[PDB]
């Protein structure tokens, strides 16, 4: 362990730790000495982007001969400084060009803005008195700070030509100071940590000295800084100031849709999305981007002292280089905007964007000093915004519309999530008690943001992003640690995936520090170049997840703290003034044990131990005294997490004992499980205490795990049915109703259990339950293989094919539309929302999952459809049945310009049809309603009949319409429903009789018409309460049953 004592002091491959904690004119005069160039308004092309301070222009007819020697490739673009605020530049233009402006644009707001902006002109500086002298040598800037306030500004009709230059040059001056404050800090670093460069800059340079910094910032560090000081000459001889920035494709933030027909908000025709949609949809490109995106900020924080305090998707710039033939697509990323950058541990000003502000900046932090932990939060949010983008892109971020705001609305009179309430000094805080818990839950495994992630995001990245966005300022990992783990995983994944460059890849891998410690800790050898190292990459990537689960700390705490006997949680009163407290003197014995276990009985110094814990766990030395306290608190309450984990997994078995065909378990707890568990254990905890919240937190955490086990067992079945035709034979045997031999069932279940491991491998490097987990599940991992094979594979054995899943869902969506009489909205998002929120109550069969708590795995498993395709599948069914219902009533009124107000000429994109199918589907609906009407007559009689329906933990009564003749008898009445039972979905009820009872059954000689209302229709078996009339397509449909 010789590399730990700060061996690489200024390297950019693995920077050192963050150990511990100028005039104004100097910073402006530093960056003001950049090369100047002049070009007219003819090399500039069409405008390409516009902000609040400037407009960017690409330059045609190449110019700026300072470039020909400069950076190869790397197209350029100027930006003219043009203040956009209350249309005052437009007013200045209309006055200068000629004519008189309107009095409507002038009076209150424009004059207010000019009055506010002519003051605060830094007329003291000597740089601002030369910037204005170069652009216009006739204006005397010392009279304009006086004329604005002596006589109020209404001389605007004669001072426009000067006000323009003054204001735009003040904008240029601010943007120049923003870069000077960085050139200063870069020079302060090149002195101490670069001997080769500072032997040719310190000798003699002032402009080359300031161009070298820009070259270093663009090429080495991946920032984006200005390179020249171009001065543009207009057609009317009015010079504007500008800067020569680099040109990217830019703005990793995609555009949203506005027509309302896209079920993921992606604008289908934005032109700039076509490439972004290729990045945010694949797994390899996203794994590469995640590691490429941390480099600039790691460099910025650990090498130089400054920090970047406005991180958000619009501020990151990209460059694609498609690489179609003979090469590969190489993505490049840079950091854009440097408006708020400042030295670390210096005083700061609260100015950011609200959705990305750390919660510890809310009231105060010693006057809000600039801490390094404010930047790790904003990258966790930014990266989570990239992994959930191809699934439900919205205009507002997920953690504020699903996690923060519905919590803020409940337990306070403060629904205002604004910046004025965030910055204010007086009032109720914004992140006080429950909003912090909601934010913590939002990113953990099972929350909303975590429900929206890609299917292919490994568990290591999920855990790391969950640890970077931690509301607690301590116990939050640093940027160096994140860079290490993400880069190591990207390298290992590219080695594993790919089938002369292997040598360079292996050297670049083993040159890291995290990998060298992992090789020392796993007892491994310097790997190879001529050996198949597959199982040695499998171990380095699996040992990198055990440190995210925090397994070494748990193994060190298992040997120190005892488990707090079970007679503590049942034999104590006053449950509001007791709480499991950690001694504070054992959180030190566990740390000593951990140090000895990790170092392997060598003797490190203190700096080496600090560096090692920062590399491996990513915290300070007084920052692991909270990680360790969490672990030993979780170890004290053993024997209560285990009893809870065992109380559930019997609810999961009762679910299959009561409803023997469910098709999912649906991770979110059914809100009734808590009362089952609290009564199962015999507990009585006041719901507002350290133990009531603990119990409600553990019940859901165990239910999510058991639902995950169920889902993996259901995916393995569908994977093993795709191969091994013998498995398919036995599966069809099971489904058809009969039963197979014993050895055939054994082979079937053995194949499914062998496929469980193939399914579990991708996201969890190994099995799902293959870690120390006996408080999460109720079963130690040694007895977990023998539970899934013998017990759980019998629940999920007979699972309906996909066509049946789609048919019953279609028929349950076409009943909700009859149930609710109102019409449907205009945008398909709202149609889906209403139809799928009113579905559990008005449908006979309950859906497998609820609205808002839906996932991509559920849909891809049950329906073979992604989430934005599942929603689009539901909306079309809804709208088409709406059109059918509208045509039926109109055909009824006629003894057709009498359709409702928004169906006379609808766009065939509201349906799924092409433009040629609507005028035929209407004719089909007409030809069908004609028969539905011809049904009615004097002889026929219509009524409803009662059967058993949904199974609530006895059954509901469910009544279905019937139409028959008066001549019919019970003889011919029972035979029809017997023949209907033959096509049931439930394989058990394919052999039943379907008598009609009153429960005294009726004589077969009686008539049916005089009996019609207490009689019900039951299914009895001829050999020996069931609801297996509900599982038929005749009883699930809308049309009435025609008994005939």
Residue numbers in the entry: 280 to 300, 307 to 784, 791 to 1186, 1201 to 1258, 1266 to 1310, 1319 to 1332, 1338 to 1349, 1356 to 1375
Could you share sentences copied from the article?
Cryo-EM, kinase assays, phosphoproteomics and cellular analyses reveal that RON13 is a secretory pathway kinase of atypical structure that phosphorylates rhoptry proteins including the components of the RON complex. RON13 is a 153 kDa type II transmembrane protein with a putative serine/threonine kinase domain and a large luminal carboxy-terminal extension (CTE) with no identifiable structural motif.
The canonical HRD catalytic triad of ePKs differs in RON13 with an HFD motif conserved among all the coccidian orthologues of RON13. The catalytic activity was completely abolished by introducing a single amino acid change (D595A) in the catalytic HFD motif (rRON13dk), validating the importance of this conserved kinase motif for enzymatic activity. To gain insight into the function and regulation of RON13 kinase, its three-dimensional structure was resolved at 3.1 Å resolution by single-particle cryo-EM. Unlike ROPKs that also reside in the rhoptries, RON13 lacks an α-helical N-terminal extension. The kinase C-lobe structure contains all the motifs required for ATP transfer to the substrate, as well as a ROPK-specific disulfide bond. Cleaved rRON13 behaved exactly as WT rRON13 when analyzed by size-exclusion chromatography, further emphasizing the strong interaction between RON13 kinase domain and the CTE. Of interest, three autophosphorylation sites were identified on RON13: Thr379 and Ser381 within the NLI in proximity to the ATP-binding site (N-lobe) and Thr703 closer to the activation loop (C-lobe).
